[PDB]
Amino acid sequence: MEIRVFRQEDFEEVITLWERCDLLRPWNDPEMDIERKMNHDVSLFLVAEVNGEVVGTVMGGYDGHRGSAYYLGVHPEFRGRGIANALLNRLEKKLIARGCPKIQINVPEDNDMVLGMYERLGYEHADVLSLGKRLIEDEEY
Amino acid sequence: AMEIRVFRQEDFEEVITLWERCDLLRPWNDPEMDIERKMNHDVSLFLVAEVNGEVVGTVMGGYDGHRGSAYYLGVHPEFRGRGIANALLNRLEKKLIARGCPKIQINVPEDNDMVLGMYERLGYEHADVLSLGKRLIEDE
Numbered sequence: 001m002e003i004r005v006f007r008q009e010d011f012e013e014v015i016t017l018w019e020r021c022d023l024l025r026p027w028n029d030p031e032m033d034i035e036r037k038m039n040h041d042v043s044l045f046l047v048a049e050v051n052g053e054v055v056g057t058v059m060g061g062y063d064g065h066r067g068s069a070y071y072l073g074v075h076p077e078f079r080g081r082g083i084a085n086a087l088l089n090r091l092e093k094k095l096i097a098r099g100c101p102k103i104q105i106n107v108p109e110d111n112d113m114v115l116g117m118y119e120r121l122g123y124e125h126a127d128v129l130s131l132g133k134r135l136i137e138d139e140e141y
Numbered sequence: 142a143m144e145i146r147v148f149r150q151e152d153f154e155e156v157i158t159l160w161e162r163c164d165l166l167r168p169w170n171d172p173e174m175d176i177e178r179k180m181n182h183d184v185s186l187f188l189v190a191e192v193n194g195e196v197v198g199t200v201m202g203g204y205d206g207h208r209g210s211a212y213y214l215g216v217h218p219e220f221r222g223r224g225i226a227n228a229l230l231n232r233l234e235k236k237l238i239a240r241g242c243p244k245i246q247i248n249v250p251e252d253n254d255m256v257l258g259m260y261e262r263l264g265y266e267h268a269d270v271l272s273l274g275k276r277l278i279e280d281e
């Protein structure tokens with residue numbers, strides 16, 4: 001396999017991958033989320049392709065101060081082969097390449113597993129509360 | 142005469158000074174480098190608040206194509222009776238909306254109830270989530 005940048009043709013294949021990995025939350029329209037990312041900057045939005053097919057994603061980003069990562073998933077049939085790791089290790093390097101000093105990720109608290117994965121890779125938990133506010137509402141889909 | 146506008150190169154050392162006075166600097170974040178990171182990337186969400194020509198508040202707003210962000214929110218100790226932080230976040234929020242950003246997320250210290258309360262009062266809600274981070278470039 002091989003990690004590259006998301007391109008428009010990857011659009012339905014990615015949604016259908018997010019489907020299979022249950023990354024889909026009713027609040028967030030994934031069509032909209034991809035459109036936003038496209039309008040914005042696709043360059044830290046990476047896909048893993050095996051056999052000329054997408055099997056993993058990470059929507060990474062950078063705001064001029066912190067790196068981010070959302071929509072990190074790997075196809076349940078492709079889960080043994082270090083894909084999410086290759087995917088995070090490519091993002092972190094693409095971030096360093098543009099002077100991003102730190103990346104920060106939110107993980108569901110009850111998910112003790114994915115929590116251990118990140119810690120393994122040298123991520124520290126911060127003693128902060130994440131606070132959020134909805135600015136634009138996504139319809140149901 | 143208070144006015145919120147976008148950060149300008151001229152504001153550079155005034156803002157650093159304000160960050161000092163606002164007890165916002167940390168030895169692991171070089172504020173010159175952070176200002177420079179931001180300028181090189183996109184300065185349009187990096188807001189200041191000026192009162193009679195003086196910069197007395199900032200917010201380094203941000204957007205990543207999915208989520209909006211805010212760092213370095215400070216208002217000069219002497220300019221705190223006046224809704225300036227509120228004005229800073231309100232404008233940032235409008236600016237995020239203007240470019241299609243659906244949501245802003247801000248991390249606040251688990252101790253700092255005064256700040257948690259401000260955000261709640263502004264309509265921010267707690268997410269049942271844990272913040273993990275990884276330093277990629279050390280400032281030194």
Ligand SMILES: [Zn+2]
Pocket residue numbers: 009010011012013
């Ligand atoms: Zn396609």
Ligand SMILES: [Zn+2]
Pocket residue numbers: 124125126127
């Ligand atoms: Zn810790």
